[PDB]
């Protein structure tokens, strides 16, 4: 659980040296985007339910995982999805603010693909839901902010694959 | 009874009673006329059901009544039949309650602690209830003997 400042301090500390010009050079780069990330995390908090409603209706709403036999049939199973998609849109918001994807594999990625295989959850439909959820997130926060929030979505999709 | 634990089941689950629970409270109360007839048979047959109950118990377990047995002498043998009158009474409660809930919290919960602490062979008192069961089911038809015997063998199961 490290942000961009924590990761910069760790690498500069792990060699026992002070924060030289290169370490502060990245820190200044993070502070420049500090204004963009909060507004990105602002609108995502507002439209959390709307984004997840848009992703599932655009990716896996009418596919036969939704129909009987599909992996999302029963109401408990459907309700687990939007609960499950809420974490991906939420933890990706944390990575967008912290500027470092360490929180994702610390709290989301580890034991995740090994868990879906246990339950039999289709990893293929899961990533496309996150990809569609990444597509709507670029709608709200804009282009570059969508590039930032989108940079952690595919990090989840990559490791979850 | 079936009414009280079908409630406390649905009570714990934060819900009302399902059709599966309410079509059986319904089915039990229409069964209530037939239950009182069955318990009415065992009510004024306790003279034979107990005395013939202790009949086969001593013929099958002469140790408990022989000198050294727990129920030895005029005294203990009277109490030897007293417990059978107890358990025969609780079976009349279970038949009317439609469950062993009356038999559960009376004469079954912690019964091994009592009889172990009294020196009584708990297997011996289990043999006594089985002898009462053959006398009880011999007093009723086949449709009833599947019930009156049904509560005895539960008492046999919990008593060992």
């Amino acid at each position: 659980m490290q942000d961009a400042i924590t990761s910069v301090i760790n690498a500069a500390d792990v060699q026992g040296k002070y924060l030289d010009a290169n370490s502060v050079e990245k820190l200044r780069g993070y502070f420049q985007t500090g204004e963009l990330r909060v507004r990105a995390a602002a609108t995502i908090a507002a439209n959390a339910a709307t984004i997840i409603k848009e992703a599932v209706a655009k990716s896996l709403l009418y596919s036969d995982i939704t129909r009987p036999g599909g992996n999302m049939y029963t109401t408990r199973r459907y309700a687990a999805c939007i609960r499950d998609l809420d974490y991906y849109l939420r933890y990706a918001t944390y990575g967008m603010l912290a500027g470092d994807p360490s929180i994702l594999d610390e709290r989301v990625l580890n034991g995740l693909k090994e868990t879906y295989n246990s339950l039999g959850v289709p990893i293929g439909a899961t990533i496309q839901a996150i990809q569609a959820m990444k597509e709507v997130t670029g709608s709200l926060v804009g282009s570059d902010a969508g590039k930032e929030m989108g940079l952690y979505f595919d990090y989840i999709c990559s490791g979850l694959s | 009874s079936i009414v009280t634990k079908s409630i406390v089941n649905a009570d714990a689950e934060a819900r009302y009673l399902s059709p599966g629970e309410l079509d059986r409270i319904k089915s039990f109360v229409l069964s209530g006329q037939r239950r009182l007839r069955i318990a009415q048979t065992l009510t004024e047959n306790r003279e034979r059901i107990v005395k013939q109950g202790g009949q086969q118990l001593f013929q099958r377990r002469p140790d408990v009544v022989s000198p050294g047995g727990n129920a030895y002498g005029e005294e203990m043998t009277a109490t030897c039949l007293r417990d059978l009158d107890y358990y025969l009474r609780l079976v009349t409660y279970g038949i009317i309650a439609g469950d062993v809930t009356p038999i559960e919290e009376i004469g079954l919960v912690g019964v091994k602690e009592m009889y172990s602490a009294l020196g009584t062979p708990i297997s011996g008192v289990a043999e006594g209830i089985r002898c009462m069961k053959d006398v009880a089911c011999s007093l009723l038809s086949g449709e009833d003997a599947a019930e009156v015997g049904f509560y005895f063998d539960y008492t046999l199961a919990a008593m060992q």
């Binding site: 408990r76 309700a79 687990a80 609960r83 974490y87 034991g111 090994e114 868990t115 246990s118 339950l119 | 079954l108 919960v109 912690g110 019964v111 091994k112 602690e113 172990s116 708990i122 199961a157 919990a158 008593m159 060992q160």
Partner: protein, 92 residues
């Protein structure tokens, strides 16, 4: 003391999990399992990871293994990491 005092059916403490663990047992397993909660959709509590791998003692593996299946869990692998086998004395 141990869980086999004489308790069985028809005894004063309620009929429950009875483990064959000796006095202060020092055997423990290494188990692995998933255990979906199956109760979050009417309680709406926060979510916790259900795939765990941990060392349970021999004194309480049976209760835990009896309970992991109570809530639909699946046990992927268990081993006896610490302790002997067929050991009369020394499990303490």
């Amino acid at each position: 003391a141990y869980d086999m005092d004489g308790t069985g059916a028809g005894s004063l403490e309620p009929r429950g999990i009875k483990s064959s663990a000796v006095e202060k047992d020092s055997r423990c397993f290494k188990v692995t399992f998933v255990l979906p909660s199956q109760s979050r959709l009417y309680t709406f509590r926060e979510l916790q990871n259900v795939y765990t791998t941990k060392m349970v003692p021999f004194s309480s593996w049976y209760a835990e293994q009896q309970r992991i299946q109570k809530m639909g869990g699946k046990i992927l692998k268990v081993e006896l990491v610490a302790g002997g086998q067929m050991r009369s004395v020394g499990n303490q």
